[PDB]
């Protein structure tokens, strides 16, 4: 949707009509969006070792004090900062992990993204066109006392979970919640942002998976995403539609 959609999105973040959203914020947000791509270019050619040592993660102990307990862990994060760089870090401070990526078309484009994220040292599973359901694999990883990483703030389909996000209705994936209730693994919200010419990363307290309510779980995970985004409102570079009302009557029919 571009800058116009980004504008309409930041509007919900700072409680403002889109036209009145501060321009310095918009400038910062687009600069972050541009930075992600500029970094994706060089990232495979950088020294992942130096980045493993130099960069850090606030309250990472949450993750360590769960894998050492043999549970496995769900690392659920929004599209903020550079999530690909945070992946590199984990590879260098744990090892290869498993995530999923929406299968793009053309396949030539998808094959370019896999070749990129494989050059960073982790495993991506497509949501379609697999020898198995990705959910099946991820569950077996969590059972093998391992961590997974999942983009968890946007899933605009019939499978999506109707949650409130900055006081408006959107839909987020249930994957993080189901895999957590099932394997009993720890569900950790995670946030990434840009910190000067560097990178910021933080792991947050695990959520209550007891109730079994996927809805209230995903909701609490959105309330955490929201608070973190409002803390770094220029790092959440979402240029695609997020909220339902920003969709056409056509694209909204697609989700029932
Ligand atoms: C602080 C803990 C570290 C966690 C590291 C998170 C790694 C996330 C990488 C997953 C990539 C998923 C790509 C799908 C998103 C897209 O391209 O639209
Ligand atoms: Na202006």
Author numbering: 48 to 303
Sentences from the paper on this structure:
Here, X-ray crystallography, site-directed mutagenesis and enzymatic activity data are used to define the three-dimensional structure, acceptor/donor substrate binding, membrane binding and catalytic mechanism of PatA from M. smegmatis. PatA catalyses an essential step in the biosynthesis of PIMs in M. tuberculosis. The enzyme transfers a palmitoyl moiety from palmitoyl–CoA to the 6-position of the Manp ring linked to 2-position of myo-inositol in PIM1 or PIM2. Our results reveal that the enzyme has an α/β architecture and shares with other important eukaryotic/prokaryotic acyltransferases an acid/base catalytic mechanism involving conserved histidine and aspartic/glutamic acid residues.
Two other crystal forms were obtained in P 21 (PatA–C16-2) and P 42212 (PatA–C16-3) space groups, and the corresponding crystal structures solved at 2.90 and 2.43 Å resolution, respectively, by using molecular replacement methods. The high quality of the electron density maps allowed the trace of residues 41 to 302 (PatA–C16-1), 48 to 295 (PatA–C16-2) and 48 to 303 (PatA–C16-3). We have decided to use the PatA–C16-1 crystal form for our description since it displays the highest resolution. A close inspection of the three crystal structures revealed that the protein crystallized as a monomer, displaying a high degree of structural flexibility in the N- and C-terminal regions (coloured in green in Supplementary Fig. 3; root-mean-square deviation (r.m.s.d.) value of 1.6 and 8.4 Å for Cα atoms in 41–47 and 288–302 residue ranges for the N and C terminus, respectively). Strikingly, one molecule of palmitic acid was unambiguously identified in the difference electron density maps of PatA–C16-1, PatA–C16-2 and PatA–C16-3 crystal structures. We believe that acyl molecule is associated to the enzyme due to the hydrolysis of palmitoyl–CoA during the isolation and purification of PatA from M. smegmatis mc2155. The acyl chain is deeply buried into the hydrophobic pocket, and oriented with the carboxylate group facing the groove and the acyl tail extending into the globular core of the monomer. Interestingly, the comparison of the three crystal structures revealed conformational flexibility in the carboxylate moiety of the palmitate, located in close proximity with the lateral chain of H126. In all crystal structures of palmitoyl–PatA and PatA–S-C16CoA complexes, the carboxylate OE2 oxygen atom of E200 was found at 2.8 Å of the ND1 nitrogen atom of the aromatic imidazole ring of the invariant H126. It is worth noting that when the individual palmitate molecules observed in the three crystal structures of palmitoyl–PatA were superimposed, they showed important structural flexibility at the carboxylate region, suggesting that the carboxylate group is not in a catalytically competent position in the crystal structures.
